[PDB]
Protein: Trypsin
Organism: Bos taurus
Amino acid sequence: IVGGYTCGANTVPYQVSLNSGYHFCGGSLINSQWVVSAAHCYKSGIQVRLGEDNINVVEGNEQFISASKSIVHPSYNSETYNNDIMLIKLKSAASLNSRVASISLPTSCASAGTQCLISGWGNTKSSGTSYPDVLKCLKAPILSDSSCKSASSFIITSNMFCAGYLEGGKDACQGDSGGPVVCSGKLQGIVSWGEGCAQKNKPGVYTKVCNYVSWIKQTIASN
Ligand SMILES: [Ca+2]
């Protein structure tokens, strides 16, 4: 997260860190046994880490659970990142408490202007590299599709939406992928991609979760 602030320990209880020997992506807990993340974050042997704040210090509220099954969206396109969403089932149910909680799925899509909360342990520099140990937060508005596509060099589909700032300075970044975009208490987006980080004229692009509720529900009920 570039231009954000320190969230505060466990203030984003649904945030998870995906670990494969090191933190490589974020995710969101949607129930005691399932996590939603980005399809481009797929890796074999993923361990899900819940209740985390500082990912390099054991603070006492962590729960480390390995994935038993991973399901990348059937139509995921690695060339365009269209349908960049993936479900991960935990080998054992997470213990829900004040520091580990699930986030609700949307019943409808969010509109432009709506304020959302984006979070993650990704790079904090628009130029260079600096990874934080504690969770970072950023408040950003959903933008119109026009502002989204204006200076884009890549395809932006109906399964994506932009959020952030056109003048740059604030944006998600590498390492934040798979993480949550929460608006009005609902998981509306998944950190997906962007051209660089916090660059002028190029806001971040997010997977539009409201388009996948049916698939998510049907898949979890059958697996
Ligand atoms: Ca920790």
The CA atoms of residues 138 and 159 lie 22 Å apart. The first helix runs from residue 145 to 149. DSSP finds two helices and 13 strands in the chain. The pocket of calcium ion is lined by residues 52, 54-55, 57-59, 62 (CB under 6 Å).
